[PDB]
């Protein structure tokens, strides 16, 4: 019937303040397919963000990959903002250099 999505925020390569990289937010295990995702930088959302084509696992739940280039710095804060039909309100997840 309905399944709320799981959320993962990380980077393509290990965090290196100063060097550039890629920011990832991976939604998975949700059904129906309809869903909205945002990548944030200190509360404000990035403009150019790309994503993967729609597909699913063998339990039929959908999955997508949202990515954006960025240069991780000492103080800069980043998170993911996801909203589904299974959500009374939008859910925000902070990125952790160690997860």
């Amino acid at each position: 019937i309905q399944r709320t999505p799981k959320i993962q925020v990380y980077s393509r390569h290990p965090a290196e303040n100063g060097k550039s990289n890629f920011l990832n937010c991976y939604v998975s295990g949700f059904h129906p397919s309809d869903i909205e995702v945002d990548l944030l930088k200190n509360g404000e959302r990035i403009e150019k963000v790309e994503h993967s084509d729609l597909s699913f696992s063998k339990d039929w739940s959908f999955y997508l990959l949202y990515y954006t280039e960025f240069t991780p710095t000492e103080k800069d804060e980043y998170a993911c903002r996801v909203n589904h039909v299974t959500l009374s309100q939008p859910k925000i997840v902070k990125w952790d250099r160690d997860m």
Binding site: Y26, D53, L54
Partner: protein
């Protein structure tokens, strides 16, 4: 070792917001190589991997055509599905289908596939014998006798055993360099304090393909299944994947723990520990 070509279709109905949308994507193991979206300005089958690009006009044509029909096919399905379940024309319903052919480390057909699911629930599915069907509810059985009556099962097979495999083999040759190459994970264990008595040990595995992997933790040789915290395998973005396990240990005993890793890129399984 062995490979597989696979297809995924997804159709959503949107009352008032236009005809139902259809998106089709094709893979070969964990790599994507095609895409089709009835919601694109000027829809056509588009490449998603470098190697597929070498195919000629015909290929792209014939496929786009098949995909346009399939768009009309699934739209009648959303419609039909309403009468099978006594549902109204006002709601939105998703249709999901999967079908492909696994080949063996030698070339011949290992096994075929085809399942269907309405709103996430399993509807009907052709059995591994490629000749009969398994229905999940009375509705599905209506679908079954149609397919049995039209010898639809046979059609599917002739494909799965012919065209499907003949191509998986071709697709694989033009993509040797990557499709047939395993990239064993780069592993290492990390330490994260928590309490003057406890501590976290996180075992990583990064940049690996294919995505099928296995990370386990052990305390004195015994498994810590119910105490380990595993994260879903997530895509890196460069085509590889990532994964990590974690277990919370008492301050001191950290050396009584050993991570274990298996992936086809590894000759023999691995065994890591914390290197302070």
């Amino acid at each position: 070792g062995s490979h597989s070509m696979r297809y995924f279709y997804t159709a959503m109905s949107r009352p008032g917001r236009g005809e139902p949308r259809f998106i089709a994507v094709g893979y070969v193991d964990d790599t994507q190589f095609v895409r089709f979206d009835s919601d694109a300005a000027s829809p056509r089958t588009e490449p998603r991997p470098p190697w597929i690009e070498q195919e000629g006009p015909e290929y792209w044509d014939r496929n786009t055509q098949i995909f346009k029909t399939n768009t009309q096919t699934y739209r009648e399905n959303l419609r039909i599905a309403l009468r099978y379940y006594n549902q109204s024309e006002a709601g939105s319903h998703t249709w999901q289908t999967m079908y492909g052919c696994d080949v063996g480390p030698d070339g011949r057909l290992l096994r075929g596939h085809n399942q269907y699911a309405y709103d996430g629930k399993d509807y009907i599915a052709l059995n591994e014998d490629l000749s009969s069907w398994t229905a999940a509810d009375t509705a599905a059985q209506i679908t079954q006798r149609k397919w049995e009556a039209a010898r639809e099962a046979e059609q599917l097979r002739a494909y799965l055993e012919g065209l499907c495999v003949e191509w998986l083999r071709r697709h694989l040759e033009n993509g040797k360099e990557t499709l047939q190459r395993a990239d064993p994970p780069k592993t290492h264990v990390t330490h994260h304090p928590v309490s003057d008595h406890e501590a976290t040990l996180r075992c990583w595995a990064l940049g690996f393909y294919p995505a099928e992997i296995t990370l386990t933790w052990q305390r004195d040789g015994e498994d810590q299944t119910q105490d380990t915290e595993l994260v879903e395998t997530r895509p890196a973005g460069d085509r590889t994947f990532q994964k990590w396990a974690a277990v919370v240990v008492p301050s001191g005993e950290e050396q009584r723990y050993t991570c274990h890793v298996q992936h086809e890129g590894l000759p023999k399984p691995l065994t890591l520990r914390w290197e302070p």
